[PDB]
Amino acid sequence: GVPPTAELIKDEAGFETGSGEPQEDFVADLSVDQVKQIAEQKHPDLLSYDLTNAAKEVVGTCTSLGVTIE
Amino acid sequence: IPEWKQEEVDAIVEMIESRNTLLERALDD
RNA sequence: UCUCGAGCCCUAGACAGCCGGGAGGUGAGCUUAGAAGCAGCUACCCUCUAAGAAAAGCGUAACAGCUUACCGGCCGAGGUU
């Protein structure tokens, strides 16, 4: 259904590609709120009951691409 | 006497309070 | 094939076998027309949960598909190094 994570990130992030090596090369950032929204768009694709966990799922694809948070 | 089997029995008993053998074990308590 | 010894596992059910489950984000990101566990490079994180790898071996043009891990059941006594 609703589009994938990789993209929903590259939008609010403002970038197109990732980093050859994540956590080492922080390509983009994402406010906590920004991650709260994405988590809301994927409510159907995710298994989590609370929004808290849904985040941990999304907040798991970013840092693995150089997408720090604030 | 594995520690994970002990933590389980307690974990199970904590849900009943609020592996088949482990369930029985818990129920027996 | 006989005998002696050591370590570890086991009726909170061991070893093997058989049955059932092996799931979602997501077909990870990169490279690439394409690559989705499995060409190569890097990373290898969290949800549900009794389990289930960013996938150990085959398989495909790439999917699909078949299985290992891992969990549960049946069974019931020694098993393994």
PDB file of C-alpha atoms (C1' of nucleotides) in Angstrom:
ATOM      1  CA  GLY A   1       0.000   0.000   0.000  1.00  0.00           C
ATOM      2  CA  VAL A   2       1.339   3.381   1.138  1.00  0.00           C
ATOM      3  CA  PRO A   3       4.788   4.058  -0.417  1.00  0.00           C
ATOM      4  CA  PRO A   4       7.989   2.630   1.178  1.00  0.00           C
ATOM      5  CA  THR A   5      10.259   4.106   3.856  1.00  0.00           C
ATOM      6  CA  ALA A   6      13.378   4.787   1.772  1.00  0.00           C
ATOM      7  CA  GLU A   7      11.406   7.393  -0.175  1.00  0.00           C
ATOM      8  CA  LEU A   8       9.282   9.031   2.534  1.00  0.00           C
ATOM      9  CA  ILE A   9      12.666   9.795   4.098  1.00  0.00           C
ATOM     10  CA  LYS A  10      14.409  11.223   1.021  1.00  0.00           C
ATOM     11  CA  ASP A  11      11.541  13.718   0.815  1.00  0.00           C
ATOM     12  CA  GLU A  12      11.442  15.480   4.177  1.00  0.00           C
ATOM     13  CA  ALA A  13      15.206  14.943   4.270  1.00  0.00           C
ATOM     14  CA  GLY A  14      15.619  16.949   1.084  1.00  0.00           C
ATOM     15  CA  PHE A  15      18.139  14.557  -0.462  1.00  0.00           C
ATOM     16  CA  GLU A  16      17.992  11.981  -3.272  1.00  0.00           C
ATOM     17  CA  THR A  17      20.551   9.261  -2.481  1.00  0.00           C
ATOM     18  CA  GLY A  18      22.040   7.803   0.694  1.00  0.00           C
ATOM     19  CA  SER A  19      25.638   7.473   1.894  1.00  0.00           C
ATOM     20  CA  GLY A  20      28.210   4.910   0.775  1.00  0.00           C
ATOM     21  CA  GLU A  21      28.744   4.298   4.492  1.00  0.00           C
ATOM     22  CA  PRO A  22      26.074   5.206   7.132  1.00  0.00           C
ATOM     23  CA  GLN A  23      26.543   6.486  10.687  1.00  0.00           C
ATOM     24  CA  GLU A  24      29.971   7.470   9.360  1.00  0.00           C
ATOM     25  CA  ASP A  25      28.615   9.848   6.730  1.00  0.00           C
ATOM     26  CA  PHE A  26      25.516  11.692   7.949  1.00  0.00           C
ATOM     27  CA  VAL A  27      23.824  12.699   4.692  1.00  0.00           C
ATOM     28  CA  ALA A  28      20.666  14.155   6.239  1.00  0.00           C
ATOM     29  CA  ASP A  29      18.847  14.835   9.511  1.00  0.00           C
ATOM     30  CA  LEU A  30      15.264  14.442  10.727  1.00  0.00           C
ATOM     31  CA  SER A  31      13.511  16.135  13.632  1.00  0.00           C
ATOM     32  CA  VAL A  32      11.645  13.848  16.015  1.00  0.00           C
ATOM     33  CA  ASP A  33       8.370  15.297  14.726  1.00  0.00           C
ATOM     34  CA  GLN A  34       9.350  14.523  11.129  1.00  0.00           C
ATOM     35  CA  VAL A  35       9.765  10.889  12.164  1.00  0.00           C
ATOM     36  CA  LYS A  36       6.424  11.063  13.997  1.00  0.00           C
ATOM     37  CA  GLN A  37       4.678  11.928  10.727  1.00  0.00           C
ATOM     38  CA  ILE A  38       6.293   9.266   8.540  1.00  0.00           C
ATOM     39  CA  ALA A  39       5.352   6.762  11.237  1.00  0.00           C
ATOM     40  CA  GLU A  40       1.765   7.971  10.789  1.00  0.00           C
ATOM     41  CA  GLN A  41       1.756   7.347   7.037  1.00  0.00           C
ATOM     42  CA  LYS A  42       2.877   3.727   7.486  1.00  0.00           C
ATOM     43  CA  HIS A  43       0.460   2.782  10.270  1.00  0.00           C
ATOM     44  CA  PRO A  44      -0.964   0.012   8.027  1.00  0.00           C
ATOM     45  CA  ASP A  45       2.363  -1.465   6.880  1.00  0.00           C
ATOM     46  CA  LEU A  46       3.796  -1.606  10.414  1.00  0.00           C
ATOM     47  CA  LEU A  47       2.943  -4.145  13.129  1.00  0.00           C
ATOM     48  CA  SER A  48       3.427  -1.866  16.155  1.00  0.00           C
ATOM     49  CA  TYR A  49       0.408  -1.077  18.356  1.00  0.00           C
ATOM     50  CA  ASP A  50       1.595   2.291  19.667  1.00  0.00           C
ATOM     51  CA  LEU A  51       3.109   5.152  17.690  1.00  0.00           C
ATOM     52  CA  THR A  52       6.151   4.811  19.956  1.00  0.00           C
ATOM     53  CA  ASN A  53       7.191   1.490  18.425  1.00  0.00           C
ATOM     54  CA  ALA A  54       6.174   2.439  14.877  1.00  0.00           C
ATOM     55  CA  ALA A  55       8.877   5.078  15.219  1.00  0.00           C
ATOM     56  CA  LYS A  56      11.577   2.621  16.329  1.00  0.00           C
ATOM     57  CA  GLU A  57      10.850   0.820  13.053  1.00  0.00           C
ATOM     58  CA  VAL A  58      11.263   3.945  10.926  1.00  0.00           C
ATOM     59  CA  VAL A  59      13.970   5.289  13.242  1.00  0.00           C
ATOM     60  CA  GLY A  60      15.783   2.121  12.230  1.00  0.00           C
ATOM     61  CA  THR A  61      16.175   2.799   8.512  1.00  0.00           C
ATOM     62  CA  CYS A  62      17.588   6.315   8.837  1.00  0.00           C
ATOM     63  CA  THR A  63      20.697   6.019  11.047  1.00  0.00           C
ATOM     64  CA  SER A  64      21.569   3.179   8.661  1.00  0.00           C
ATOM     65  CA  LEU A  65      21.806   5.729   5.843  1.00  0.00           C
ATOM     66  CA  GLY A  66      23.415   8.668   7.607  1.00  0.00           C
ATOM     67  CA  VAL A  67      20.160  10.264   8.725  1.00  0.00           C
ATOM     68  CA  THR A  68      20.844  11.677  12.197  1.00  0.00           C
ATOM     69  CA  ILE A  69      18.050  13.044  14.384  1.00  0.00           C
ATOM     70  CA  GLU A  70      17.482  16.122  16.557  1.00  0.00           C
TER      71      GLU A  70
ATOM     72  CA  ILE B   1      18.631 -25.193  35.963  1.00  0.00           C
ATOM     73  CA  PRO B   2      18.833 -22.627  33.105  1.00  0.00           C
ATOM     74  CA  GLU B   3      18.222 -19.026  34.126  1.00  0.00           C
ATOM     75  CA  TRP B   4      16.028 -18.328  31.097  1.00  0.00           C
ATOM     76  CA  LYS B   5      13.601 -21.041  32.176  1.00  0.00           C
ATOM     77  CA  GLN B   6      13.406 -19.387  35.587  1.00  0.00           C
ATOM     78  CA  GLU B   7      12.823 -15.918  34.152  1.00  0.00           C
ATOM     79  CA  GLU B   8      10.090 -17.459  32.004  1.00  0.00           C
ATOM     80  CA  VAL B   9       8.170 -19.133  34.822  1.00  0.00           C
ATOM     81  CA  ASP B  10       8.186 -15.773  36.596  1.00  0.00           C
ATOM     82  CA  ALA B  11       7.245 -13.949  33.399  1.00  0.00           C
ATOM     83  CA  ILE B  12       4.348 -16.353  32.844  1.00  0.00           C
ATOM     84  CA  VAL B  13       3.208 -16.127  36.454  1.00  0.00           C
ATOM     85  CA  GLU B  14       3.254 -12.347  36.058  1.00  0.00           C
ATOM     86  CA  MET B  15       0.697 -12.498  33.233  1.00  0.00           C
ATOM     87  CA  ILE B  16      -1.512 -15.161  34.822  1.00  0.00           C
ATOM     88  CA  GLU B  17      -1.399 -13.052  37.976  1.00  0.00           C
ATOM     89  CA  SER B  18      -2.800  -9.996  36.172  1.00  0.00           C
ATOM     90  CA  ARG B  19       6.589 -24.502  26.716  1.00  0.00           C
ATOM     91  CA  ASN B  20       3.710 -26.515  28.147  1.00  0.00           C
ATOM     92  CA  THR B  21       5.922 -27.644  31.029  1.00  0.00           C
ATOM     93  CA  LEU B  22       6.676 -24.030  31.909  1.00  0.00           C
ATOM     94  CA  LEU B  23       2.982 -23.126  31.723  1.00  0.00           C
ATOM     95  CA  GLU B  24       2.117 -26.009  34.061  1.00  0.00           C
ATOM     96  CA  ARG B  25       4.989 -25.001  36.344  1.00  0.00           C
ATOM     97  CA  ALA B  26       3.550 -21.476  36.535  1.00  0.00           C
ATOM     98  CA  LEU B  27      -0.009 -22.697  37.002  1.00  0.00           C
ATOM     99  CA  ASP B  28       1.194 -24.966  39.796  1.00  0.00           C
ATOM    100  CA  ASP B  29       2.472 -21.863  41.583  1.00  0.00           C
TER     101      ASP B  29
ATOM    102  C1'   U C   1      34.849 -54.723  18.764  1.00  0.00           C
ATOM    103  C1'   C C   2      36.141 -54.722  24.102  1.00  0.00           C
ATOM    104  C1'   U C   3      37.821 -51.671  28.384  1.00  0.00           C
ATOM    105  C1'   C C   4      39.136 -47.068  31.228  1.00  0.00           C
ATOM    106  C1'   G C   5      38.954 -41.600  31.905  1.00  0.00           C
ATOM    107  C1'   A C   6      37.536 -36.070  31.183  1.00  0.00           C
ATOM    108  C1'   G C   7      34.156 -31.980  29.641  1.00  0.00           C
ATOM    109  C1'   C C   8      29.237 -30.478  28.598  1.00  0.00           C
ATOM    110  C1'   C C   9      23.665 -31.216  27.916  1.00  0.00           C
ATOM    111  C1'   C C  10      19.172 -33.681  30.132  1.00  0.00           C
ATOM    112  C1'   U C  11      12.110 -35.692  33.082  1.00  0.00           C
ATOM    113  C1'   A C  12      11.933 -27.342  33.899  1.00  0.00           C
ATOM    114  C1'   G C  13      12.160 -33.407  28.471  1.00  0.00           C
ATOM    115  C1'   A C  14      18.075 -33.884  26.486  1.00  0.00           C
ATOM    116  C1'   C C  15      20.153 -36.271  20.985  1.00  0.00           C
ATOM    117  C1'   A C  16      17.628 -37.896  16.572  1.00  0.00           C
ATOM    118  C1'   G C  17      13.167 -38.267  13.921  1.00  0.00           C
ATOM    119  C1'   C C  18       8.219 -36.689  12.450  1.00  0.00           C
ATOM    120  C1'   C C  19       4.322 -32.590  12.405  1.00  0.00           C
ATOM    121  C1'   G C  20       3.275 -27.317  12.826  1.00  0.00           C
ATOM    122  C1'   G C  21       5.449 -22.176  12.741  1.00  0.00           C
ATOM    123  C1'   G C  22       9.395 -19.847  10.268  1.00  0.00           C
ATOM    124  C1'   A C  23       6.382 -13.423  10.247  1.00  0.00           C
ATOM    125  C1'   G C  24       6.254  -7.730   9.221  1.00  0.00           C
ATOM    126  C1'   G C  25       9.024  -2.388   8.227  1.00  0.00           C
ATOM    127  C1'   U C  26      11.474  -4.027   3.476  1.00  0.00           C
ATOM    128  C1'   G C  27      11.783  -6.162  -2.591  1.00  0.00           C
ATOM    129  C1'   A C  28      17.527  -2.894   3.494  1.00  0.00           C
ATOM    130  C1'   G C  29      21.156   1.366   1.300  1.00  0.00           C
ATOM    131  C1'   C C  30      24.692   1.571  -2.537  1.00  0.00           C
ATOM    132  C1'   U C  31      26.161  -0.079  -7.569  1.00  0.00           C
ATOM    133  C1'   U C  32      23.005  -1.118 -11.720  1.00  0.00           C
ATOM    134  C1'   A C  33      18.466  -1.026 -17.182  1.00  0.00           C
ATOM    135  C1'   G C  34      17.757  -4.886 -13.140  1.00  0.00           C
ATOM    136  C1'   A C  35      19.545  -7.503  -8.417  1.00  0.00           C
ATOM    137  C1'   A C  36      14.508  -8.331  -4.294  1.00  0.00           C
ATOM    138  C1'   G C  37      19.215 -13.414   1.935  1.00  0.00           C
ATOM    139  C1'   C C  38      22.390 -15.215  -1.459  1.00  0.00           C
ATOM    140  C1'   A C  39      27.140 -10.616  -8.605  1.00  0.00           C
ATOM    141  C1'   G C  40      29.951  -6.840  -5.820  1.00  0.00           C
ATOM    142  C1'   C C  41      30.572  -2.782  -1.813  1.00  0.00           C
ATOM    143  C1'   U C  42      28.743  -0.966   3.192  1.00  0.00           C
ATOM    144  C1'   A C  43      25.800  -1.341   7.032  1.00  0.00           C
ATOM    145  C1'   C C  44      23.735  -5.573   9.670  1.00  0.00           C
ATOM    146  C1'   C C  45      19.466  -1.907  12.801  1.00  0.00           C
ATOM    147  C1'   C C  46      13.356  -2.753  15.534  1.00  0.00           C
ATOM    148  C1'   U C  47       8.189  -4.491  15.484  1.00  0.00           C
ATOM    149  C1'   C C  48       5.123  -8.605  16.677  1.00  0.00           C
ATOM    150  C1'   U C  49       6.399 -12.705  19.714  1.00  0.00           C
ATOM    151  C1'   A C  50       6.560 -18.965  21.954  1.00  0.00           C
ATOM    152  C1'   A C  51      10.145 -18.272  17.472  1.00  0.00           C
ATOM    153  C1'   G C  52      11.941 -16.278  12.872  1.00  0.00           C
ATOM    154  C1'   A C  53      19.387 -13.676   9.887  1.00  0.00           C
ATOM    155  C1'   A C  54      19.803  -6.511   6.762  1.00  0.00           C
ATOM    156  C1'   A C  55      20.059 -14.594   5.768  1.00  0.00           C
ATOM    157  C1'   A C  56      24.108 -20.580   6.520  1.00  0.00           C
ATOM    158  C1'   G C  57      23.273 -23.802   1.584  1.00  0.00           C
ATOM    159  C1'   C C  58      20.907 -24.930  -3.300  1.00  0.00           C
ATOM    160  C1'   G C  59      17.929 -22.668  -6.748  1.00  0.00           C
ATOM    161  C1'   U C  60      16.361 -18.057 -10.766  1.00  0.00           C
ATOM    162  C1'   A C  61      17.741 -13.812 -16.436  1.00  0.00           C
ATOM    163  C1'   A C  62      16.008 -11.281 -12.024  1.00  0.00           C
ATOM    164  C1'   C C  63      11.334 -13.136  -8.947  1.00  0.00           C
ATOM    165  C1'   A C  64       9.342 -17.772  -7.612  1.00  0.00           C
ATOM    166  C1'   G C  65      10.459 -22.081  -5.093  1.00  0.00           C
ATOM    167  C1'   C C  66      13.124 -25.714  -1.373  1.00  0.00           C
ATOM    168  C1'   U C  67      15.427 -25.833   3.011  1.00  0.00           C
ATOM    169  C1'   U C  68      19.570 -24.296   7.923  1.00  0.00           C
ATOM    170  C1'   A C  69      19.220 -21.460  11.628  1.00  0.00           C
ATOM    171  C1'   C C  70      15.673 -19.968  15.411  1.00  0.00           C
ATOM    172  C1'   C C  71      10.103 -21.492  18.336  1.00  0.00           C
ATOM    173  C1'   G C  72       6.214 -24.732  19.690  1.00  0.00           C
ATOM    174  C1'   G C  73       4.172 -30.095  19.656  1.00  0.00           C
ATOM    175  C1'   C C  74       4.344 -35.461  19.497  1.00  0.00           C
ATOM    176  C1'   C C  75       7.855 -38.955  21.822  1.00  0.00           C
ATOM    177  C1'   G C  76      10.423 -40.491  26.471  1.00  0.00           C
ATOM    178  C1'   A C  77      16.117 -41.709  28.523  1.00  0.00           C
ATOM    179  C1'   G C  78      20.218 -41.208  28.276  1.00  0.00           C
ATOM    180  C1'   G C  79      22.725 -38.088  24.865  1.00  0.00           C
ATOM    181  C1'   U C  80      27.064 -35.400  22.961  1.00  0.00           C
ATOM    182  C1'   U C  81      32.196 -33.881  22.633  1.00  0.00           C
TER     183        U C  81
END
